[model samples]
Target chain A: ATITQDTPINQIFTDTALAEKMKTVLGKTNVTDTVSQTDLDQVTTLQADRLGIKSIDGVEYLNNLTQINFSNNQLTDITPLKNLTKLVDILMNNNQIADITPLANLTNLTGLTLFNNQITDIDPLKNLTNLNRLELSSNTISDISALSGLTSLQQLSFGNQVTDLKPLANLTTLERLDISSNKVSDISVLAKLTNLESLIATNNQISDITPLGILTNLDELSLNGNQLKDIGTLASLTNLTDLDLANNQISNLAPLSGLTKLTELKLGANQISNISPLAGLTALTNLELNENQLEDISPISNLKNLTYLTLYFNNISDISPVSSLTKLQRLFFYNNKVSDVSSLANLTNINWLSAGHNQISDLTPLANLTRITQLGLNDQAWTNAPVNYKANVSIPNTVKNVTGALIAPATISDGGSYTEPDITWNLPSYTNEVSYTFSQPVTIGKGTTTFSGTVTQPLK
Target chain B: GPLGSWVIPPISCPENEKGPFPKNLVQIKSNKDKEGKVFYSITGQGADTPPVGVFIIERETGWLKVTEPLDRERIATYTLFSHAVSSNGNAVEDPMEILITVTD
Candidate 1:
């Protein structure tokens, strides 16, 4: 660590030739990676220490190294890691590293997660084909032309930033892909991936699912929170077992009759009047049709195996057909118009029922639920007169809530240095209470608040 | 002896005390001297302060005297003086020196 005038900095180098060769490996730092290059100093220091190497001035001594992790070191330049040809995985995230030009030399890299690094140029990664997964989230990166060569990629998480996916057209071996939260305007590029089993592209700007019509191999799809007004393209996915399109512009589900393998379907917060397409999905053990416009459940008489069903806020005013679902253990029908559940003679199997905020005039059928423990009947009807609503009809007196309080004190060093200042307060006494919460913020104002007390172990 | 009086005879670097001189000394020379030229012409302000009481420097020799009682606070304060020697309207190769001292 100590080098004098007679002991030149170069005398400490084990491989002088390798050091000089790597000097020009990475070109100038890309401006998109940093507004000012002041962050490069921090990146180099963190990189040098994390890799267990000493740095002369600010440059790392990467001699005789095979693997390195320079991720989240605020890296603004990758010329150093790019020159290390033996590297397998380089997780560089949460930095300003933009220039990946040197990555072309490291063809042996198997995994790279450059998440949130504001990378705009990936042109250097054209030859990095040995990768299995590449995560480039929270960046300003748009150029993905180099990803076309990575044939071995199994998983890709391209969050909410990719504007053009034409570059990923060649990655055909991908199994699981999350292009969610992106500006992807085209799914035609992803239509060719026949091996893809799970594709979660939720909360994206996609308006059409026609590109996914050819992907019959997909078993799990989460297109929730998209701009999809049409589910017609999904009619081809007959192998889908779990599908989530929770928050969308979908109005009709007549296109879903072909999907018979579904086990769980979440169609919440949509505008669907008829659920006839889902009537044939008898394999659906869990269905969330909450917040819809369905007036009748006469279409779901065959779905008797459903264990958990949520019909919280709908226009369905009848509970007569739900009595056939003998396997139903938990049902949520909060905020509905179905008044009386007295017709539910076989409702004894239903132990947990949530019928809050309805015009139910009687809960006489609930008296038959002998094993019932939890019932959420909290609303105007539970307190209004005409219904004579009483939660005691279902809930037993053996239930009790144990008292518990959590006390969590905020620290001083959360914002800066940890210095306990003098504060005046009385100590509280409590038994069997093990937790606390500093519900309000503790502020250290500039003036009037003077430090004049002893410093304890942990002050309140 | 009544307060003695003497003309401040023309002085040159004393023949034995002459050659190169300390530059800080006030030098005096005569037209008859061949060693160096006098920097300034000195004339006697004869015996005006007292009866036969006057101070003078010999023109040929670097000698000083007070032909009267020395007034330490006023006149005897100037103990050392200097002059540069020039000849033929050019500086001489060796400057001259004339040093003096007076005390109560």
Candidate 2:
């Protein structure tokens, strides 16, 4: 059964309104008669992008329209296209349109992109069941309960303030999802989206990533700029080629021992000290281990396929282990205690080298590096001679320390106070010992309401 | 936690009833766990009894029945030692006396 809305030909194309709308859309400055059905039936696509058409009042007469691109327009209301049920793709991105109730019955939509709009409610999309690629990014939508059962979605992006992902648990057909810059912490609901190939959940408050362990099909995953500490659960994702775990609190690299398929891996600004677990990752082409505490890089000699490598800001005294990586194109070992550049003499393929702020004193070892274009050897004892190498270097307060111990009164005395000693930590990493004295004396009954405040401490 | 495999209170029957009288006299609340499958039986009686066919009990439901009418003038009461046992006839509780008062 086909559902069709009845509108008289005179009202559907009222006077010369359809012709006026088409004149601005098609730029046909010819005959000014009303655009008839014969002329509209021949047209299947209408591209009126950036035409500044504020309203599509007369476009519904073209019922044969299947694809419409009205992006970059000043249009506010799209209710004129409600009668065109044969539409398969609609691109109305970058508009001020907020209400989408007019597109409720358009079940034939497969591709819809309404990004950068003022839309907040998406209840009308519950009937658009055939959607495959839906991009509502940069919108004001906060609730996603309406997009639950649309299991045909393969790529979905809703980069906004979406915290709850329970509604997306049934969309198992998803291959790419980007919900970055949200408040989502628990991703266990995405464990069933096993078909996902690429997921970017960056800039969130996620700390536990055990739910992403089952997603072995993921090829590119970016969990950067989060509060993640342990990634041991992601050991099974051997198919990952590009992974970014930058700005995290990870210290151990043992969980990434088997992920040899990685070509580009970013672990910058972490707390890693031992890199022995990464000795088997021979397929690495580009690796970043900057701002860590690595002293011995002997394990990195196994990675002979590396092209871009950075071991900046460490306490290394030797650089001989990385001498075998002849494929290196860019090497950044800035801010270390290396006094010898003899190992770097054979690295002739290096084009960008930043070994600044080190203890090296000789320029003879760097004579063979003819491909060096951008070199940063500042704050060292090397003088400009062969290539005139001139370079420059361009670049929370302690919260969880005190143990909130419930110190009860020493004796069963009535209305008398007892001093509850404050717990203190005298570790070297912590600066000054902080004490929390409960100012308000708790009542005598079975006390339950506890003290709530952040304890400040520096990391070890 | 049930009635400890013992009958509650006691049973009573009205005397001077006609013969061929089959009536449920007492519902022995021999409370035990349902999985235990408890059964009720009249194990012993006083030496001076009216007849052996006076009282009976259903095996499974613990419903004590009176088959024949009793004469209150001859025996004022019928003393029955009831025992609660499991499905295998294992005594779940010691036999307790149940006094059946016969009224005129």
Clash number for candidate 2: 3
Put down candidate 2 lDDT per residue, A21-108, tens digits, no spaces: 5655444464343344565676688866555567777677678889997765666888888888899988777678898888888889
Candidate 1 residues lying further than 4 Å off, grouped into runs, are A1-80, A92-104, A326-330, A342-353, A361-375, A381-460, B1-104
Docking class of 1: incorrect
Give each model a TM-score: 0.53, 0.60
Model 2 misplaced regions, further than 4 Å: A1-35, A47-58, A72-75, A368-370, A379-460, B1-104
Q: After superposition, how far is residue A358 of candidate 1 from its true place, in Å?
A: 1.6
Q: Write down the TM-score for model 2.
A: 0.60
lDDT of candidate 1 over A332-406, digit per residue (tens)? 776687766766558666645666556553344455565543454433132222211222111111111111111
